[PDB]
């Protein structure tokens, strides 16, 4: 029981780490969804600056 | 004990679910990170293009 609970606790420990990582990574993903979009926007804003400078 | 083992399995189960969800967001993060990277690479190419056009 103690080891089964220990496993539940170790698994809970890992779970919490994974949960924290899931949120951290998901939140970093969201940051990167937004950043990938901001960089995409920079690609377009830059294309417009290129177009402006091109004109 | 049966419950503790069950909890070890449920928490391990959840860990595995989180590992798959974490890998899913981590891999999707790699995709978004890579997209951010690609968008940043293109952004830099465009900045470089701005520099070319600016020059």
Curated annotation (Swiss-Prot), chains A, B:
Tissue: Detected in primary breast cancer tissues but undetectable in normal breast tissues in Sudanese patients. Isoform 1 is expressed in adult and fetal skeletal muscle and cardiac tissues, with higher expression levels in the cardiac tissues. Isoform 10 is expressed in adult and fetal cardiac tissues, but not in skeletal muscle.
Subcellular location: Cytoplasm, Cytoskeleton
Modified residues (Phosphoserine): 11, 31
Function: Binds to actin filaments in muscle and non-muscle cells. Plays a central role, in association with the troponin complex, in the calcium dependent regulation of vertebrate striated muscle contraction. Smooth muscle contraction is regulated by interaction with caldesmon. In non-muscle cells is implicated in stabilizing cytoskeleton actin filaments.
Record's comment describing the protein's domains: The molecule is in a coiled coil structure that is formed by 2 polypeptide chains. The sequence exhibits a prominent seven-residues periodicity.
Disorder cited: Cardiomyopathy, familial hypertrophic, 3: A hereditary heart disorder characterized by ventricular hypertrophy, which is usually asymmetric and often involves the interventricular septum. The symptoms include dyspnea, syncope, collapse, palpitations, and chest pain. They can be readily provoked by exercise. The disorder has inter- and intrafamilial variability ranging from benign to malignant forms with high risk of cardiac failure and sudden cardiac death. Cardiomyopathy, dilated, 1Y: A disorder characterized by ventricular dilation and impaired systolic function, resulting in congestive heart failure and arrhythmia. Patients are at risk of premature death.
Family: Belongs to the tropomyosin family.
Subunit comment: Homodimer. Heterodimer of an alpha (TPM1, TPM3 or TPM4) and a beta (TPM2) chain. Interacts with HRG (via the HRR domain); the interaction contributes to the antiangiogenic properties of the histidine/proline-rich region (HRR) of HRG. Interacts (via N-terminus) with LMOD2 (via N-terminus) and TMOD1 (via N-terminus).
Protein name: Tropomyosin alpha-1 chain
Species of provenance: Homo sapiens
Recorded name of the encoding gene: TPM1
Stretch of the intact protein here: 176 to 230 of 284
